[PDB]
Write a protein that binds this ligand. Structure first.
Ligand code: CLA
Ligand code: CLA
Ligand code: CLA
Ligand code: CLA
Ligand code: CLA
Ligand code: CLA
Ligand code: CLA
Ligand code: CLA
Ligand code: LHG
Ligand code: LMU
Ligand code: PQN
Lengths: 742, 144, 124, 165, 40, 80, 73
């Protein structure tokens, strides 16, 4: 019964610049200094690999804890800059008056070498680069009405950034927690559930109830922003709040007397979108965060720390034991309290999956005012948070394999769930292998079937709505069920959560904010492409984790490590057998799969949702050509890539000309990467020998011997440039397109 | 030292089993058997995946290829300080013994071994490929 | 040994397989070929008739689809024959031999084409 | 003129190009106020545009049918017709700087080869020495030539490693 | 202070200062002599 | 079967023998070096061609060389 | 060839005929051109201009050349 308590060590390390002048001090191998250029790359590659510098878990934990303070400090500088640039280099104040006609802008360029053309005409008597980060919509929702309020937040952001860097220094050099402190998982969950998420949600509800709701109620009514009461006047004067919301006339007595229905005027359950602004009701959002606050505060009292009551996480795991799974979850608690990589593997997996869920829910239920009708912001936010989720998931595979090689110990795992999974890995990979082949034929083969039938003049033989049909009947049933939910299954909800299920469109400023989305044959075909490309990415990453330690090819792969190039040309060739190489290959397939996801979103929205409302009806940007054209590969090439890339390639000579340059430059970086992917360092080391000879001939040969990159670094350099070039190409193409037409 | 004789009835470790074991090759071409003595019951890692408990006293395992047997041998020697030995077994019932070929592990020099494939020259003293051309088959200068 | 599992080792599953023509020993390879060929041949006609290029023609759809099913059975019979030639060039069951497989392939052709013809008669 | 080109000052297409660029700037100007920040910036751009087109014409460049300046690279044609400033003079401008940078780096590399640990003098630069060599590089062409004539510029063939052949 | 000045002498720090200086000089020259195409 | 050759620059460090994952190499007595031992390759029919031995040889150039040759079940490292 | 030699400026040469059972009727009509009996491919190798230049004028000239080269083969 080890008590939960604060435990630190005093002055563990000395604050000196001595080691700043000795590169490689952290590692025994690199401490001797460079002899070849390979040393330089090894210095940066192993800088943050704490688990390999020392075998002491306590020393590893202390570095992780302070390295996290540095990450927090950097985010505050970044957040401070965004708020500062809104105050000093933005047209936010003008935007508040005319949100539907003025384009948000918060970056201004200097007039040098003729780059001032990038300062486009955005409105409000202002010239600058149009932003798609959605900060203006967020600030309006919170109630910010002046650049002074933006300026104060930026100054507070810098103070927080300074505090974060002090904390990192303090908790590493002055008072470093001990290992027993880091292993109170029960205590950490209690504080992070009820304290971080719980009180954070309650505190934000306080801001919305007292600041956001009154300010946005008057803004929607048409009051001039400068004439709205200041947030502190709303807080101090209950009389003002009573005018906007009569419930405030009764104070907090209804809360304590359980007459919670008194607060129905500002704690609503409307659902749908606010017709004036096209975003979610803030009164709905306040009741959401109040409900979420109670749920998490209750959640934070589940685990036992010092007073008997509560649950032991070890006891829960050991009780869940069945007939089909041997020992069961035994041994997981020790794994998850002694392996940072195991924790990172789980957290990256769910944190990445969460970022993808955010993308879907924010577009379908636009939570900020004037977010929906700003098509550039909708496209950018969905695409940004899908890419973030994709990279995190691939990392989850990377750090699951690191755990398998380094932190896995067979003695602690005998006949438990983890052990039994390893003992039928061939069954898992063989079945997942077949599923991917099945899904590739029956999804991408349909496109090839349609392309061939169309080229042969046999449209009646294609898979389409006017031909052989493939209707997503299951998805269509769910769309109808959610559309009728307020009638019978959610009686107290006035409207459906989203307008995608069905009903009538909401139009703000003559543009569609959201309308029902219909699923047809093309939607059926594209969705099963997603299932195909996701399943393949699982195959590559799961295969790397399950075969990290051994396989039928390399029986002792664990001893080779996690990151090695091969085991030589024997056995026919063993290139790229290490678990690191399964992340390397998995990155390509993740990029392949998410590219189709963001092409699907971009074409579907422009074709079927986005558009201009007029007397006759809705005219969409691409005029509803998704249904008939997206069932062939030729349709995507012609109607999507070729037609919509018109904006980016005609950008020269305008404020969008920067996107044209990056469109070409991205194409360049991508092709440049194939040099590293298609070649091997054997050629390049011999090339450097001849180059070194010329320098030797001129007495200008370096003391640090030039070396061609290692095998692994060639693959890492290749994939990094491949991803940057490919993703930046879509980024330029999307923004130049949507900003130009959207 | 004399060549050990394999005992097919030797007990095997406590192992549930896995899908990484023998295939149809063992029934048609050959398979490999590794045996050793255990001082105490202990958990070790199977080269085919998973964990097994070695019984105290003799233990016996069967593997699909030689590298798997010698991978387990390295684990037993380095960590548990044991002295395993493994054989090659053919479907006809013949048993061939190897590692240690003469009873002493190859890392240690032993009298009586005869050098094989030893060239009394350097790599840089091989003849050019033209001088071993049309020798009836693709032959490297190192072979001659 | 191999990972035991109900699918791999169950009583009900084992009995079902033991009654299939492939595993039913004691039957001449030719007869097993006919029994196997009939089952596959009968099914093979379905997809061709319903989804073939001439599926929407009232009466030609049945004929064209079945005639294409007969063609595929002929190609499969060739695959069976050459497989036996390559595999068996030099044991308990007669089927897995050069003599047995050649009879098996011949039976499959006779049974398969009969099944395709029998399927057509069902339609008309 | 040269190769069928004509002086930009006398080129019809060149003059028309200036109007197009100024017209584009003027069109954006009339949507702002007289002395607002955007208007002042646009007026500044127009002044630079007018200055640029006057400077290129004053420089005596040649314009093609496209009405854009073209440069003359042959030294004989450049010096013959006063186009030395396009490519010829900038050629010797770059080489002086390029040789300066290369010569300074070579001097530093030789300097540290005599030290006990040359490798640590390359990742961690000896700034006092580098600044000393930075200033002395202004006379690199003189120093470079004298090394060539004294035979200390190149290594001996016998002191350079080569692969088997 | 000796160690701190040694840290500033490391290759990445020197390159940042050197290119920051080099870039600044080029940027400033083009600020006072905009659009240079011919030596003239 | 691959071809493995030991050259007279061997110093008898034994690192090639330890590295080999198939017990192809062994040490034998010799008089041509201080260690009085030389590497030997008596069981090349089990060699798979991984070249772990070449990775472990300290001499320059290598004293143990592997020339990949005819493939087989053993040299191709198959368990099926 | 015999039609092309008359008006080489305004006639597309034909490479060979098409017999593809997978074609639909729109495809059959689309590739019918040049006054041909059925679908055909347009030649791009320039053999028409080459053969016309060297003195070939009729289909029988090409037939005799084809048999002669088959014999030489
Ligand atoms: C989010 C970014 C981030 C963070 C939080 C860290 C954090 C850390 N790095 Mg890392 N690093 C990063 C990015 C980051 N790094 C990147 C992008 C690279 C290039 C590949 C490196 C290369 C690198 C090296 C080579 C080294 C570190 C080291 C360190 C550690 C000590 C740093 C220190 O004392 O700073 C003190 C910071 C301040 C006093 C702030 C003011 C001064 C700065 C310069 C502004 C610490 C765990 C060192 C270490 O000991 O690692 C174990 C080390 O040697 N990092
Ligand atoms: C994520 C962080 C971030 C980023 C990427 C930028 C980026 C930029 N800032 Mg900003 N800035 C930030 C945070 C950030 N800032 C913060 C936290 C503050 C508060 C101190 C400021 C205060 C600030 C000012 C006061 C100015 C900028 C300006 C600039 C621009 C020119 C910078 C430059 O070349 O300086 C010069 C480079 C070196 C000194 C090296 C550039 C777009 C300038 C701008 O946009 O002018 C029109 C400008 O005047 N920034
Ligand atoms: C001035 C204050 C100071 C000083 C003198 C030291 C001194 C020391 N620290 Mg400490 N430290 C400090 C502040 C300081 N620290 C702070 C503020 C933190 C919180 C983050 C830490 C956290 C910390 C950790 C976790 C560790 C040390 C360690 C060390 C030792 C080596 C550090 C090293 O090599 O840094 C040289 C490194 C750098 C100059 C890199 C700076 C990285 C920062 C975070 C900036 C990141 C910028 C980012 C990449 C920007 C984007 C890049 C992109 C634009 C290209 C040494 C005793 C290490 C130790 O004792 O090992 C045994 C160690 O593990 N420190
Ligand atoms: C964390 C969130 C949060 C916070 C901080 C607040 C805060 C506030 N709410 Mg709000 N509210 C919230 C959530 C929140 N609310 C939620 C979720 C709901 C929905 C149920 C409401 C519904 C609601 C209503 C209906 C009303 C308020 C009101 C108020 C105000 C007065 C409350 C009161 O009477 O307190 C009573 C007393 C206290 C809170 C104790 C104060 C203790 C002080 C700070 C101790 C200081 C000690 C220190 C040593 C002294 C200084 C010494 C130094 C100078 C030397 C106050 C600004 C009232 C108001 O005025 O609205 C305009 C009001 O009518 N709230
Ligand atoms: C919470 C996030 C997180 C954290 C804390 C870590 C932490 C760690 N990872 Mg993991 N990882 C993550 C996410 C994370 N990872 C994700 C999302 C992926 C998938 C891509 C991976 C994939 C991965 C691999 C494959 C490996 C690690 C490794 C490591 C370890 C060493 C990393 C190192 O030294 O980097 C040093 C940092 C650098 C060398 C800088 C990289 C710079 C990139 C390539 C720049 C890309 C472009 C840039 C962002 C934008 C343009 C720049 C501009 C200048 C052009 C360390 C424990 C390594 C290890 O050995 O672990 C045991 C290892 O092999 N990680
Ligand atoms: C367009 C390029 C392309 C294509 C077509 C494929 C195809 C495939 N890859 Mg590969 N891959 C590619 C690029 C490509 N890859 C790249 C650039 C990389 C490097 C990053 C990889 C890395 C990679 C990995 C690491 C893996 C794959 C996998 C796969 C397979 C997925 C499952 C499957 O069988 O689908 C079905 C097959 C197809 C869709 C191919 C086209 C089929 C056509 C349209 C229909 C059939 C034709 C028909 C019979 C007519 C033939 C007539 C003719 C005989 C006369 C498949 C064979 C995974 C795998 O093997 O999973 C089992 C896998 O693990 N790929
Ligand atoms: C890169 C190779 C190259 C080429 C293809 C040319 C081509 C030309 N040069 Mg140029 N030139 C070059 C390099 C070159 N030059 C170099 C490196 C120099 C020294 C810095 C010169 C110096 C030079 C002068 C001084 C003159 C030319 C002239 C010419 C033109 C006619 C004579 C000539 O050079 O014939 C072909 C070129 C060569 C065989 C290579 C060597 C050329 C020598 C150096 C110059 C020959 C000049 C010639 C004797 C003049 C006679 C009168 C002329 C009107 C017929 C012709 C357009 C003449 C001109 O302006 O004509 C209109 C002229 O007067 N060149
Ligand atoms: C082969 C490469 C190349 C070349 C030869 C040039 C050449 C030129 N560029 Mg271009 N440029 C290039 C690549 C190149 N560029 C690339 C890759 C980009 C994209 C980043 C650009 C983007 C670019 C812009 C945006 C601009 C130029 C401009 C210029 C001019 C600069 C003159 C100057 O600064 O004088 C300054 C004078 C000096 C003497 C500088 C040297 C100073 C030292 C100390 C002298 C020492 C003497 C002893 C010149 C004609 C400018 C222009 O007006 O062009 C017409 C201009 O605005 N370039
Ligand atoms: C579904 C299968 C549930 C299976 C299920 O719930 O089983 C339940 C069963 C749990 O048995 P126990 O009661 O002994 O488990 C006790 C637990 O507390 C764990 O220790 O799990 C297993 O037997 C594990 C292996 C299942 C092997 C399943 C193979 C088929 C996989 C198909 C994947 C389809 C994915 C579709 C995604 C939409
Ligand atoms: C964790 C708990 C954190 C609590 C933080 C509380 C911060 C409070 C700041 C605002 C102070 O104001 C809060 O109390 C005042 C005094 O009763 C109320 O004042 C109200 O009632 C007074 C009664 O005499 C009247 O004189 C005021 O005109 C009227 O506005 C405000 O309506 C209320 O918002
Ligand atoms: C091009 C290439 C190389 C050669 C690339 C190398 C050696 C990297 C070059 C990096 C830079 C350009 C060199 C180092 C620059 C110094 C830091 C000094 C710069 C000084 C100033 C100019 C900044 C490989 O080594 C390689 C290895 C494996 C597979 C593929 C490849 C591959 O394709």
């Amino acid at each position: 019964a080890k008590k939960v308590k604060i435990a630190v060590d005093r002055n563990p390390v000395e604050t000196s610049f001595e080691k700043w002048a000795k590169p490689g001090h952290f590692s025994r191998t690199l401490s001797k200094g460079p002899n070849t250029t390979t040393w330089i790359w090894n210095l940066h590659a192993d800088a943050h690999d704490f688990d390999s510098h020392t075998s002491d878990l306590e020393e590893i934990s202390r570095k992780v804890f302070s390295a996290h303070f540095g990450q927090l400090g950097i985010i505050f500088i970044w957040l401070s800059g965004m708020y500062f640039h809104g105050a000093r280099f933005s047209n936010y104040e003008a935007w508040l008056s005319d949100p539907t006609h003025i384009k948000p802008s918060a970056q201004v360029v200097w007039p040098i070498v003729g780059q001032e053309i990038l300062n486009g005409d955005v409105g409000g008597g202002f010239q600058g680069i149009q932003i798609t980060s959605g900060f203006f919509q967020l600030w309006r929702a919170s109630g910010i009405t002046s650049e002074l309020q933006l300026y104060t937040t930026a100054i507070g952001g810098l103070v927080m950034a300074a505090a974060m860097f002090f904390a990192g220094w303090f908790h590493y050099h002055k008072a470093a927690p001990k290992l027993e402190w880091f292993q109170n998982v029960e205590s950490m969950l209690n504080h992070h559930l009820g304290g971080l998420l719980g009180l954070g949600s309650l505190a934000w509800a306080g801001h919305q109830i007292h600041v956001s709701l009154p300010v946005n109620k008057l803004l929607d009514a048409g009051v001039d922003p400068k004439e709205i009461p200041l947030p502190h006047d709303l807080l101090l004067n209950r009389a003002i709040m009573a005018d906007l919301y009569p419930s405030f006339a009764k104070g907090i007595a209804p809360f304590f007397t359980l007459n919670w229905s008194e607060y129905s005027d500002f704690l609503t359950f409307k659902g749908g979108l606010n017709p004036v602004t096209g975003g979610l009701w803030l009164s709905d959002t306040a009741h959401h965060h109040v409900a979420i606050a109670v749920l998490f505060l209750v959640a934070g009292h589940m685990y036992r720390t010092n007073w008997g009551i509560g649950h032991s996480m070890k006891e829960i795991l050991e009780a869940h034991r069945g007939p089909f799974t041997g020992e069961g979850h035994v041994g997981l608690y020790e794994i998850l309290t002694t392996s940072w990589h195991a924790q990172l593997a789980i957290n990256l997996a769910l944190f990445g999956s969460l970022s993808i869920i955010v993308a879907h829910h924010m577009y379908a239920m636009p939570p900020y005012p004037y977010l929906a009708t700003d098509y550039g912001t909708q496209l950018s936010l969905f695409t940004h948070h899908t890419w973030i989720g994709g990279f995190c998931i691939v990392g989850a595979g990377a750090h699951a394999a690191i755990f398998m090689v380094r932190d896995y110990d067979p003695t602690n795992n005998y006949n438990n769930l983890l052990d039994r999974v390893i003992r039928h890995r061939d069954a898992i990979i063989s079945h997942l292998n077949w599923v991917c082949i099945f899904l590739g034929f029956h999804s991408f083969g349909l496109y090839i079937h349609n392309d061939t039938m169309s080229a042969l003049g046999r449209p009646q033989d294609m898979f389409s709505d006017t031909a052989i049909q493939l209707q997503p009947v299951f998805a269509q049933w769910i769309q109808n069920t959610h559309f009728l939910a307020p009638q019978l299954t959610a009686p107290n909800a006035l409207a459906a959560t989203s307008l995608t299920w069905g009903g009538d469109l909401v139009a703000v400023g003559g543009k569609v904010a959201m309308m029902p989305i219909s699923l047809g044959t093309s939607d059926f075909m594209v969705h099963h492409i997603h299932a195909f490309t996701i399943h393949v990415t699982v195959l590559i990453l799961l295969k790397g984790v399950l075969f990290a330690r051994s396989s039928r090819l390399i029986p002792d792969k664990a001893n080779l490590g996690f990151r090695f190039p091969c085991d030589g040309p024997g056995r026919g060739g063993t290139c790229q057998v290490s678990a690191w190489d399964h992340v390397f290959l998995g990155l390509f397939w993740m990029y392949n799969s998410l590219s189709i996801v963001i092409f699907h979103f971009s074409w579907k929205m422009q074709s079927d949702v986005w558009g201009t409302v007029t007397a006759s009806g809705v005219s969409h940007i691409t005029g509803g050509n998704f249904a008939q054209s997206a069932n062939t590969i030729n349709g995507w090439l012609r109607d999507f890539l070729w037609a919509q890339s018109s904006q980016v390639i005609q950008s020269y000579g305008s404020a969008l000309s920067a996107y044209g340059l990056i469109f070409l430059g991205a194409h360049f970086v991508w092709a440049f990467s194939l040099m590293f992917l298609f070649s091997g360092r054997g050629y390049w080391q011999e090339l450097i020998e001849s180059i070194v000879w010329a320098h030797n001939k001129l007495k200008v040969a370096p003391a640090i011997q030039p070396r061609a990159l290692s095998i692994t670094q060639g693959r890492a350099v290749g994939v990094a440039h491949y991803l940057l070039g490919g993703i930046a190409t879509t980024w330029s193409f999307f923004l130049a397109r949507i900003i130009s037409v959207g | 030292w004399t060549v050990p004789t394999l005992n097919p009835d030797t007990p095997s470790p406590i192992f549930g089993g896995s899908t990484g074991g023998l295939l149809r090759k063992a029934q048609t071409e050959e398979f490999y058997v590794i045996t050793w003595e255990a001082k105490k019951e202990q958990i070790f890692e199977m080269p085919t995946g998973g964990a097994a408990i070695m019984r105290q006293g003799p233990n016996l395992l069967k593997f699909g290829k030689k590298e798997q047997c010698l991978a387990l041998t390295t684990q037993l020697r380095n960590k548990f300080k044991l002295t395993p030995c493994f054989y090659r077994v053919f479907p006809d019932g013949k048993v061939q013994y190897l590692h240690p070929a003469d009873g002493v592990y190859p890392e240690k020099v032993n009298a009586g071994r005869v050098g094989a494939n030893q060239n009394m020259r350097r790599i840089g003293q091989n003849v050019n490929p033209i001088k071993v051309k049309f020798s009836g088959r693709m032959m490297s200068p190192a072979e001659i | 040994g191999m990972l035991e599992t109900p699918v791999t080792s169950a009583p009900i599953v084992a009995t079902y397989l033991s009654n299939l023509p492939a595993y039913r020993t004691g039957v001449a390879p030719v007869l097993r070929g006919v029994e196997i060929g009939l089952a596959h041949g009968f099914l093979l006609a379905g997809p061709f008739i319903k989804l073939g290029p001439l599926r929407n023609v009232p009466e030609t759809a049945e004929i064209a689809g079945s005639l294409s099913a007969a063609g595929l059975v002929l190609i499969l019979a060739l695959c069976l024959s050459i497989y036996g030639s390559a595999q068996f060039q030099s044991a308990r069951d007669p089927l897995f031999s050069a003599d047995g497989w050649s009879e098996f392939a011949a039976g499959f052709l006779v049974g398969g084409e009969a099944g395709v013809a029998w399927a057509y008669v069902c339609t008309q | 003129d040269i190769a069928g080109l004509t002086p930009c000052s006398e080129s019809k297409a060149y003059a028309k190009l200036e109007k197009k660029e100024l017209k584009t700037l003027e069109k954006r100007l009339k949507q702002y106020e007289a002395d607002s920040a955007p208007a002042v910036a646009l007026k500044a751009t127009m002044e630079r545009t007018k200055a640029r087109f006057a400077n290129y014409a004053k420089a005596g460049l040649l314009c093609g049918n496209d009405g854009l300046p073209h440069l003359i690279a042959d030294p004989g044609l450049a010096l013959k017709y006063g186009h030395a400033g396009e490519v010829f003079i900038p050629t010797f401008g770059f080489l002086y700087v390029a040789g300066y940078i290369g010569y300074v780096g070579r001097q530093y590399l030789i300097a540290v080869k005599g030290e006990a640990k040359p490798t640590d003098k390359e990742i961690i630069i000896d700034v006092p020495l580098a600044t000393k060599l930075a200033w002395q590089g202004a006379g690199w062409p003189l120093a470079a030539v004298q090394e060539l004539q004294r035979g200390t510029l190149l290594e001996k063939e016998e002191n350079i490693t080569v692969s088997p052949r | 202070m000796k160690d701190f000045t040694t840290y500033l002498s490391t290759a990445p720090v020197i390159a940042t200062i050197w290119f920051t200086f080099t870039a600044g000089l080029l940027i400033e020259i083009n600020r006072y002599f905009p659009d240079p195409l011919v030596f003239s | 079967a691959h071809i493995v050759k030991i050259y007279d620059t061997c110093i008898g460090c034994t690192q090639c023998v330890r590295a080999c994952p198939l017990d192809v190499l062994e040490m034998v007595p010799w008089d041509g070096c201080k260690a009085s031992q030389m590497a030997s390759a008596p069981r090349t029919e089990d060699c798979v061609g991984c070249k772990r031995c070449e990775t472990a040889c300290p001499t320059d150039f290598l004293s143990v060389r592997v020339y990949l040759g005819s493939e087989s079940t053993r040299s191709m490292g198959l368990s099926y | 060839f015999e039609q092309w030699v008359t008006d080489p400026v305004h006639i597309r040469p034909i490479a060979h005929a098409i017999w593809d059972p997978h074609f639909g009727q729109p495809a059959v009509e689309a590739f019918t051109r040049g006054g041909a009996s059925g679908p055909v491919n347009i030649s791009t190798s320039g053999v028409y201009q080459w053969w016309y230049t060297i003195g070939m004028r009729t289909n029988q000239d090409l037939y005799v050349g084809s048999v002669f080269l088959a014999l030489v083969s």
